[PDB]
Design an enzyme around this catalytic site. Structure first.
Site, PDB file in Angstrom:
ATOM      1  N   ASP A   1       0.860  -1.239   0.000  1.00 41.87           N
ATOM      2  CA  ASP A   1       0.000   0.000   0.000  1.00 41.87           C
ATOM      3  C   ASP A   1       0.868   1.250   0.000  1.00 41.87           C
ATOM      4  OD1 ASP A   1      -2.251   1.693   0.997  1.00 41.87           O
ATOM      5  OD2 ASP A   1      -3.278  -0.188   1.544  1.00 41.87           O
TER       6      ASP A   1
ATOM      7  N   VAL B   1      -6.720 -15.045  -6.179  1.00 44.20           N
ATOM      8  CA  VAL B   1      -6.798 -14.001  -5.117  1.00 44.20           C
ATOM      9  C   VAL B   1      -8.144 -14.021  -4.431  1.00 44.20           C
ATOM     10  CG1 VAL B   1      -6.576 -11.463  -4.826  1.00 44.20           C
ATOM     11  CG2 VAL B   1      -5.064 -12.709  -6.387  1.00 44.20           C
TER      12      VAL B   1
ATOM     13  N   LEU C   1      -1.958  -2.782  17.941  1.00 43.40           N
ATOM     14  CA  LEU C   1      -1.612  -3.504  19.151  1.00 43.40           C
ATOM     15  C   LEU C   1      -2.684  -3.593  20.205  1.00 43.40           C
ATOM     16  CD1 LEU C   1       2.049  -2.053  19.347  1.00 43.40           C
ATOM     17  CD2 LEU C   1       1.408  -4.312  18.489  1.00 43.40           C
TER      18      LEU C   1
ATOM     19  N   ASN D   1     -14.436  -0.321  -5.606  1.00 40.46           N
ATOM     20  CA  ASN D   1     -15.486   0.565  -5.159  1.00 40.46           C
ATOM     21  C   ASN D   1     -16.370   1.084  -6.292  1.00 40.46           C
ATOM     22  OD1 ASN D   1     -14.436   0.287  -2.483  1.00 40.46           O
ATOM     23  ND2 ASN D   1     -13.133   2.114  -2.774  1.00 40.46           N
TER      24      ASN D   1
ATOM     25  N   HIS E   1      -3.522   6.065   3.838  1.00 38.28           N
ATOM     26  CA  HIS E   1      -4.212   4.781   3.494  1.00 38.28           C
ATOM     27  C   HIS E   1      -3.540   3.548   4.005  1.00 38.28           C
ATOM     28  CE1 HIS E   1      -5.672   1.720   0.551  1.00 38.28           C
ATOM     29  NE2 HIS E   1      -6.813   2.359   0.612  1.00 38.28           N
TER      30      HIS E   1
ATOM     31  N   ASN F   1      -3.309  -3.246  23.670  1.00 34.72           N
ATOM     32  CA  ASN F   1      -2.649  -2.495  24.815  1.00 34.72           C
ATOM     33  C   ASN F   1      -3.732  -1.612  25.418  1.00 34.72           C
ATOM     34  OD1 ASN F   1      -2.911  -0.457  22.810  1.00 34.72           O
ATOM     35  ND2 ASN F   1      -0.694  -0.418  22.333  1.00 34.72           N
TER      36      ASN F   1
ATOM     37  N   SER G   1     -11.199  -1.219   0.479  1.00 35.22           N
ATOM     38  CA  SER G   1      -9.836  -1.154   1.004  1.00 35.22           C
ATOM     39  C   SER G   1      -9.839  -1.456   2.524  1.00 35.22           C
ATOM     40  CB  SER G   1      -9.179   0.227   0.934  1.00 35.22           C
ATOM     41  OG  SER G   1      -8.755   0.443  -0.403  1.00 35.22           O
TER      42      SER G   1
HETATM   43 CA   LIG Z   1      -4.252  -0.523  20.841  1.00 33.24          CA
HETATM   44 CA   LIG Z   2     -11.026 -13.584  -6.852  1.00 35.31          CA
END
Ligand SMILES: [Ca+2]
Ligand SMILES: [Ca+2]
EC number: 3.4.21.62
Length: 275
Positions: A32, A174, A75, A155, A64, A77, A221
């Site tokens: 990305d 994919v 994380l 989109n 992005h 936390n 996305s």
């Molecule tokens: Ca966190």
């Molecule tokens: Ca596919």
């Protein structure tokens, strides 16, 4: 205080977290716009930049990549948010510039890097209306090499009776991810077609932004990293499963929604997929 984004709960990730499954030792590549490695709620293990003018993969001038990364692995936390696989090893593979666009050559360079560096999971929250033999070859090579490849569907919404799924999501190798809201309704923007595989939360998704910030974004996305993170959880529970097995389990244990042309197999359920 840490908040758990609706989307994380909606795919049933917290059930696994409770068991001690959080994606440890699973290498996830976010291909990305880079990831802000300075964000206190993220931990970046490595990566590479393939954007000629932006050589540091750890600087996200777009926002992005960072946002996508937090959905995968913010994380566990006492601050910010919580990723689907908070213990995953996160890699910033920068193939998009500040404007959010990038050349195919750069993207392919990033997939090749991911295969060579033994990434377990690849997340591609990007797409173009046209494919190429080189793009197809790279994703196919990754899958052949045992990598789980996940991509946003696009989109583009509906268009008469045609598929609006973009590349590389359109390739059979994919996993193509469409977006639902918190009520399990398809987002009006989510691309459609026989190549759509699964759905995940994609509307108003709260995640990390560069500069120690957090904000919501909507799009396929934002759906894709929920599936990428789900694959990392599965692999942390069943380290000897092949990419094929992870994929089949995700597709096979969905909550069914409407027609597959609009919803694919339905909404992922990682708790069911993880057996
Ligand atoms: Ca966190
Ligand atoms: Ca596919």
């Amino acid at each position: 205080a840490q908040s758990v984004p609706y989307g994380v709960s909606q795919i049933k990730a917290p059930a696994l977290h409770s068991q001690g499954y959080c994606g440890s030792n699973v290498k996830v590549a976010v291909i990305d716009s880079g990831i802000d490695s300075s964000h206190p709620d993220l931990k970046v293990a490595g990566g590479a930049s393939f954007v000629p003018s932006e050589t540091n993969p750890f600087q996200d001038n777009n926002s992005h990549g960072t946002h996508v990364a937090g959905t995968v692995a913010a994380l566990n936390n006492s601050i910010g948010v919580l990723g689907v696989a908070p213990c995953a090893s996160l890699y910033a593979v920068k193939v998009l510039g500040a404007d959010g666009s990038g050349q195919y050559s750069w993207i392919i360079n990033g997939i090749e890097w991911a295969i060579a560096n033994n990434m377990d999971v690849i997340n591609m929250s990007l797409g173009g209306p046209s494919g190429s033999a080189a793009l197809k070859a790279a994703v196919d090579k990754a899958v052949a090499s045992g990598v789980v490849v996940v991509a946003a569907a696009g989109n583009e919404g509906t268009s008469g009776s045609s598929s609006t799924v973009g590349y590389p999501a359109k390739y059979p190798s994919v996993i193509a991810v469409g977006a639902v809201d918190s009520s399990n309704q398809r987002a009006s923007f989510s691309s459609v077609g026989p190549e759509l595989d699964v759905m995940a939360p994609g509307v108003s998704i709260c995640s990390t932004l560069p500069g120690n910030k957090y904000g919501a974004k909507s799009g396929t996305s934002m759906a894709s990293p929920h599936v990428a993170g789900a694959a990392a959880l599965i692999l942390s529970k069943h380290p000897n499963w092949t990419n094929t097995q992870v994929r089949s389990s995700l597709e096979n244990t969905t909550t069914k929604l409407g027609d597959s042309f609009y919803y694919g197999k339905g909404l992922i359920n990682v708790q069911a997929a993880a057996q």
